[PDB]
Each structure stands twice: as structure tokens, then as C-alpha cells.
Amino acid sequence: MFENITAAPADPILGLADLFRADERPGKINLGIGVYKDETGKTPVLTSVKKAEQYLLENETTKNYLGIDGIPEFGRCTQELLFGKGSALINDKRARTAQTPGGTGALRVAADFLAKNTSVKRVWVSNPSWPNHKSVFNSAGLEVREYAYYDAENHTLDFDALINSLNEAQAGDVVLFHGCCHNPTGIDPTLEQWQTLAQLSVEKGWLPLFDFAYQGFARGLEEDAEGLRAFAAMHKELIVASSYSANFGLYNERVGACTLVAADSETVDRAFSQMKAAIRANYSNPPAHGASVVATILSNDALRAIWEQELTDMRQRIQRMRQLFVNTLQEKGANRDFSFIIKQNGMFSFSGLTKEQVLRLREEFGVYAVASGRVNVAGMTPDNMAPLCEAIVAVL
Amino acid sequence: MFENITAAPADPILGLADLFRADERPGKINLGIGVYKDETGKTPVLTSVKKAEQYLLENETTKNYLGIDGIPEFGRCTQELLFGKGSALINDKRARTAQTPGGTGALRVAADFLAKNTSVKRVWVSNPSWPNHKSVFNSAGLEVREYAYYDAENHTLDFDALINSLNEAQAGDVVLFHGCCHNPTGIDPTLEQWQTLAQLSVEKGWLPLFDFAYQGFARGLEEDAEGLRAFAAMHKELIVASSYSANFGLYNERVGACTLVAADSETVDRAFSQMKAAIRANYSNPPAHGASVVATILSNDALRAIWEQELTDMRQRIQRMRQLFVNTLQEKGANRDFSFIIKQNGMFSFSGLTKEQVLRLREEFGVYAVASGRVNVAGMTPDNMAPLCEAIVAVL
Ligand SMILES: Cc1ccc(COP(=O)(O)O)c(/C=N/[C@@H](CC(=O)O)C(=O)O)c1O
Ligand SMILES: Cc1ccc(COP(=O)(O)O)c(/C=N/[C@@H](CC(=O)O)C(=O)O)c1O
Questions:
Q1: What CATH topology corresponds to B11-44+316-396?
Q2: Which of A69, A178, A213, B262 could form an SS bridge with B268, CB 3.0 to 4.6 Å?
Q3: Does the distance separating the beta carbons of B62 and A43 come in below 8 Å?
Q4: In B, residues 174-233, which contact A (CB 8 Å cutoff)?
């Protein structure tokens, strides 16, 4: 049965870990996968998380199965983060949330739900995007089409090209939007742009799917949700796939959510019954530990205050690194202007490096980035900045 | 988009929780979903698990992502449980394991891997089986066909009917086998029967898929794997979907494994690369907490000894309940012979009750079973046995 199976191609992101682990050179520098590091080059457990885990160890008295949709308090806390306290979507009972194994699991549940229960055949994704978006949607049988997004000459969102690309989308197609901290560009719509897209989407009949992996890493928790909220004010229906991996430092615990919104509570409840059936046929019900840590933190004033500050600390450290990177490239003799990196949002920016420069940086200098030129600024530290920048200048 | 979605049908198992929770009557008795209860009618965290969780709280210093296939030590420990220390499959590097979100996730990963990478179109499942097997396989695009299994007049495995049914399977079809503690019948092949099926499967070209949700609940950890090991000795290729939910009391932490076996290490590694690609497009990588508890326990002599005894304790308590149930039915005036229940394995036996008897038991008596007549013996206790039996006698 398995004699002719052809090997799969390298995961362009996750595959970097095997290479990095196998690299026995001392001064190797990891700017690949999107995990936050602190000033020591490590990814500690958040203190709020350790406190919540201690509380769970002391107080949990069963591991009996969650419901298919997971912990109810987690769902309520997720909806309040997405839509705001006092949102009409919440008051009108228009949204149902399933806790999922990560943001990736939330994207797969959304795709399986749409493929099996709606007329959807195509999802529109930005060029460029996270490379796993295409794989997730195709695995559910959905075609992926690309829309233009990025002007690489001026390092801006090419809004006119984006609009033009999307004119080819039919009513009933899905359009995927990154909620904030676009991966890989770091370039997000302004609020006015989000409002223009919300009105356009209603006019053209697109179903919005928001992917919200980095809420809190651009400007703040509420500010980062403004684009999604502008869409929510205008649309009867949308889907949000969100993740708590980065903003709680809970990557390996697989904590995400798929939130379905419909015109009214009767419709969302009927539609959600099919989303639950799609989950039951995949992984049955979701992992409790990470979600119970998030719900424990978000529902306790003291833990929530500690956590919000830890998130602010991460965001501010990445901003300090963007500035230190730009300043150090100049000092090490880089040819050009990299000042666009300062304005960008989230863990990632596009260095502008070619696929060959990125390969040379790994092979010759032990500096690991993604082949698209995406660099994880959150992997930069005061201690590794100089060698990193010297290596980059050397490949320019 | 969602205006016409038809509501999904009740999950015949998981749906019982909403009904049971909503039932405000005092003496309600839960014999539905397959979760173990102790003599108090509760599902505590195992002591070995609490000890391992304390160790993790003290010693974990990151939540950085696992590999797509999860914790390497967990994979090694799973293979040794499945195949035995010193197995040729392990020595020859013929098996690769992915840690998955539960046994359900392992079944879905297997199905997506087979659908996308092999000629498989059909999976053969026993009539009766767990009702979610059909949903999982159909969600991946595979047809499900049934094979005869159970003689309900004599309460035995109808081996001749099983063989006859399977003559219709073509070479390259998958046949699903429950490794031990068949759900819902509790009736497993004898070792000779397993050996006969292993030889038949090789002759007819079937790809075996073992589902191993209850290792340790029939007779013991090694004894329960004898049928799988008889198949492993005869086959170049097979797949095992296993779960640690019941045997570690870790249901909500989603701890399972998908193990692929091929003729040699080159083939299994090539085939496994595609299994990893199927996982990446589903939930990306698996939840660490529960798997790290299992690996911590299985790799430490002291914790492993505590755990093995806790599992023996669960198994023996269920056996005591089978005997107490049979004795108490007789004392409360049940018409017939229920002595077949004593011989059966695992959490479940078929009571023989009709779908209407089961509905009446819920509506009139607050006793909750599955509509197939399956009862969770592990939900029975000395304190609830008399009212339970009185109710059953009342509906006969
Ligand atoms: C836009 C976007 C959507 C969804 C995910 C997956 O997050 P999860 O851990 O499943 O909650 C990522 C994550 N990107 C990271 C890590 C990854 O590739 O797995 C990255 O781009 O390096 C992402 O960047
Ligand atoms: C044969 C079989 C294969 C796979 C599973 C799922 O276990 P997981 O928790 O995903 O590791 C069950 C579980 N059966 C239980 C609970 C359930 O239906 O979800 C049951 O039959 O009540 C099962 O009985």
C-alpha cells in the first residue's frame, strides 16, 4: 500500500527546526518560526500562565471530556476580546465559539464546515500570506485564489491592486483577512481601509474569514480588533479563527477558537450544530489544559492584569528590536533604507532578502530565516544583533 | 450563506451530556458516555497524573511548539506498549508514531493520510461499532462498509458471519479491528481467532487499521496487545490509532497516537512525511500537556508503577461491577440470563435492551444509556446498583 508514496516537500517554516537542531555550530541565530523570545533568546512560560497552572493543579478534580465546543467561559472570554464588551453580536446571541486545537485547528474546522454545509468553493488569500493557509483550505477541498496586497517598491499596502484583484471574486466566495500583524509583511490596513473593505465586502457578497493569530502585538488588544469590529458592524455573517499561542505564550498547548456569526440566534445555533458535527469527526473535543489556563486568567482580575502587562512587555520588546535592527544595519554598513521596518507590526517583517540570500545566511553564517525573506524580529536580542547584522550586510 | 443550513442530528453519545446536565431530578444515574467512575460515582484525576503534573509545573521552562509528530519519548513509549520491548518492528525502525489529539484525532489523521496518499476508497467496520467511526472515515471521503460480528442469540463473536462478510472486501480495502474491549459488545477475538484473521488479512490483501482505545481494560497491558502483535508478526504494513484517554483518565487532554508501520525504514519514513503534511494542514502540531504527562509517567519507574496499579484498580472495579450487576438483576426479579455480561471486556456491554426501553429508562427513571442498549458498567457503583436494577427490571 505504501511502496509508491512520494515524500512530502519540506515545510518551509516548521522544517527549520530540524535543520536548526541539527546545526552543531555555536553562534547560530534563529529568526525562523514565529515564536516570541525574550532578551535572553528564550521562550519562557509566562508568569500569569504558571500561576494559573498552579491553581489548576490544586483545584481540578477531573479530566472528564469537555463539550465538543470546549469550555463555555473560554468561549465567552474569546467573544469579548474579539467584539468588545457590550457588542450587539454578543447581546443578540449571534455568535457561537468552538474552542479548537490552535488557530490552525480553527482554520481547518472553518474550512470543513464551509465545504460540507455551504456553497463555498474558493477562498481568497493575500499574496503573500502564511504558506499553510493554502494547505489547510485545499485539505478541505476548497480552491485557493490570491489577491494582491503588497507594494514591495514602497513597502506599503497596495490597496488599489488588492481591490482590483478581488473584483474577480464572486458573491459567496470567502475572503481571508489577517486581523492585525499581517504575516509576513507586517503591513495592516488603516482603520479607514478596513471600513472601505467592510462596505465593499457587503456590496460584493463575500463571506469574511478573519484569521487573528496576534491580537495585542500591533498596538493593543482593543485597537488590534478595530478592523474585525468594523466588519462585524456591517455583516450578518462572518467567521473568526483566532489563536492564543503567541499572546499567551501557549504555542504547544494548542489553544484557539473558531467563532461563527450569523444574522440571528436561531440561524447561528443551527449552523453551529454542523460545526460541532465537523469537529466530532476530526478530533472529537478540544484539549483542556491551555484553554483552561486562558479562561482562568481572563476571568480573574489579578491574573488578567499580570497577563496584559506581560503582553505589553512582549510587544514593546519587539518594537525595541525593530529600532535596534534598523540602527545596527546602518552602522554595519548596509546599503539601503530599512526604516520601513520600524512601522511594521507584529513578530515579522520582510527583510527584502532574496531566497538565495536567505539560503546563504543559513549555510555560511548560521542565521536562519524563512525563504520568503521573512525574519522573526522577536528572535533578535541586544546580544545577537551585531553578528546578525554583520551577516546580513555580508550577503547584500 | 448560512440561512439554509439544516441542523445536525443528535450525537448519540456526546449529546447525552446535555440531556443529563439539563435533567434536574436527584437520583439520575449516568451509564452513557465511556468514562470510568470510581466507587463514589466520580472521575478523579489519577494520582500518578497529579504527580506528573506537579513535576511538569516545577520543571517546564517553555511552551515552544512540539514537532508535528509530537514528543519523541511519547512515540517510543507508545510503540513499546503496542508492540512489546524488543519487537522486530522497533529494532528494524519500521514504525513511526505521531502524537495526536486523542484516539479520534489519530483515526482522522489515518483517514486523511490514506485518502490523499493511497488507493484506499473503503474501510470495513464491524456491525456494531462506535458510531463515530463512520463519521470520521466519511469526513475524509472514504466509504464505510460493515462486517458482521455479533451473534445476539448466543452472545458470542459470530466468526463465520464475520469471515463471510469480509469475503466481499477487495484487496487494498482497509479493515478496522478493535484491539481489545470491543465497543459496544465487549466481545473480543480469542488469540486463535486473531491469528486466523491475521493470516486471512495477509492472504486477501487487506490493510489492517487497529483502534486501541482501551489497552489494559480487558486483561492487562501486554495481554490486550496480543491480537495486534499477531497481526504485526504477519504484515508488512498496518496503522494503529491508539488512545490514552481511558487508561490514564486523561479524556479532556486529548492524548492519542497514530502509528504507521511499513516494510522497512526507508518506506515508513517516506510515507510518514505525508502523514506529517496531513497533520500540518489540520491542527499543525499536537497538545503537549497530556502527552507530556504520559511520557513522564511511562519513562519513570516509580510513576509507572503507581500508574499500572491504578489501571489494574480500574479494571478490577469494573469486573466487580459486572458481577454485582448480574447478581442484582436476578435479585430484583429480572426474567433472564445475563451471565454473559461477566465474560465481557471493558467498560461496555450490550444490555439487550431495545431503543424504546432505553428511552423509557431515561424519561421515566432518569437512568441514561445509549440507544443501542450499550451500558457503561464503569458508571455503576454499590450505591446506585439497586435503583438502577429496579428500573431495568421495570422496563423489561
Ligand atoms: C497567520 C497565521 C495563522 C495561523 C497560525 C498558526 O498558529 P497556532 O499555533 O495554530 O495557533 C500562524 C502561525 N505562524 C507561525 C508558526 C507556524 O507556522 O506554525 C509562523 O508563521 O512561523 C499564523 O502566522
Ligand atoms: C472504539 C473507540 C475509538 C475511539 C474513541 C475516542 O477516544 P478519544 O477520547 O478520542 O481518545 C472511543 C471513545 N468512546 C467513548 C467516548 C466517545 O464517544 O467520544 C464512548 O464510546 O462513549 C472509542 O470507544
A1: Aspartate Aminotransferase, domain 1 (3.90.1150)
A2: B262
A3: yes
A4: 207
Determine whether the interchain pair B101/A254 forms a contact, defined as Cβ–Cβ distance below 8 Å.
yes
In the numeric block, the cell 514528543 is attached to B71
Q: Does A343 touch chain B (CB under 8 A)?
A: no
**Minimal C-alpha gap between A334 and chain B (Å):** 33
Give the amino acid at B96: R
User: Which residues in chain A are classed under CATH 3.40.640.10?
Assistant: 45-315
What angle do helix axes A226-234 and A191-204 make, rounded to 10 degrees? Answer: 30
Helix axes B385-395, B301-331, angle to 10 degrees: 50
Q: B177-189 burial by CB neighbour count: b if 16+ within 10 A, else e?
A: bbbbbbbbbbbbb
Ligand 2: residue of B11, B104, B350, B375 to mutate (most ligand atoms within 8 A of CB) is B104
b/e per residue A44-80 (b: at least 16 CB within 10 A): bbbebbebbbebbeeebeebbbbbbbbbeebbebbbe
Cell of A385: 544583533
Rounded-to-integer distance, Cα B205 and Cα B210, Å: 16
Contacting residues of B for A44, CB less than 8 Å apart? 61-62
Q: Which fold has domain A45-315?
A: Aspartate Aminotransferase; domain 2 (3.40.640)
Q: State whether the Cα torsion A113-A84-A286-A218 is positive or negative.
A: positive
- Please give the Cα distance from A221 to B307 (Å, whole number): 43
Cβ separation of A254 and B6 shorter than 8 Å? Answer: no
* Residue B395: count of CB within 10 angstroms of its CB: 16
| A37–chain B Cβ distance below 8 A for any pair | no
CATH 3.90.1150.10 in chain B, residue ranges: 11-44+316-396
Helix (H), strand (E) at residue B348: strand B348-350
Which chain A residues contact residue B130 at CB under 8 A?
none
Binding site membership of B13 for ligand 2 (Cβ less than 6 Å): yes
Nearest to B83 by CA among B198, B255, B267, B225: B225
CB A133 within 8 A of CB A146: no
Helix segments in chain B, DSSP class H: 16-22, 47-59, 72-83, 88-91, 102-117, 132-139, 159-166, 191-204, 221-224, 226-234, 245-248, 265-280, 288-298, 301-331, 355-365, 385-395
SS3 helix, strand, coil % of chain B, rounded to 5?
Answer: 50, 15, 40
| Closest-approaching ligand to the CA atom of A131 | 1
Is B104 a pocket residue for ligand 2 (Cβ < 6 Å)? yes
Closest CA to A281 of B136, B251, B4: B136
Residues B124 and B176 sit within 8 Å (Cβ to Cβ): yes
Q: Which residue type, as a one-letter code, is found at position A201?
A: S
Q: Is A41 annotated as a binding residue?
A: no
Q: How far apart are CA A205 and CA A228, in angstroms?
A: 17
> CA quadruple B21, B346, A278, A248: dihedral positive or negative?
positive
CA angle B252, B254, B258 (to 5 degrees): 155
Give the technique used to solve this structure: X-ray
C-alpha gyration radius of chain B: 21
**Alpha carbons B178 and B192: distance in angstroms, whole number:** 16
Question: Cα(A326)–Cα(A3) distance, rounded to whole angstroms?
Answer: 51
CB A264 within 8 A of CB A250: no
Question: Which atom from ligand 2 is nearest to the alpha carbon of B178?
Answer: 1
- Using CA atoms, how far apart are residues B216 and B382, in angstroms rounded to an integer? 23
Final resolution, Å:
1.5
- A14 → closest Cβ in B35, B251, B280: B280
Identify the bridge partners of residue A211 per DSSP, sorted by sequence position: A178, A241
For residue A182, which atom of ligand 1 is closest to its CA? 1
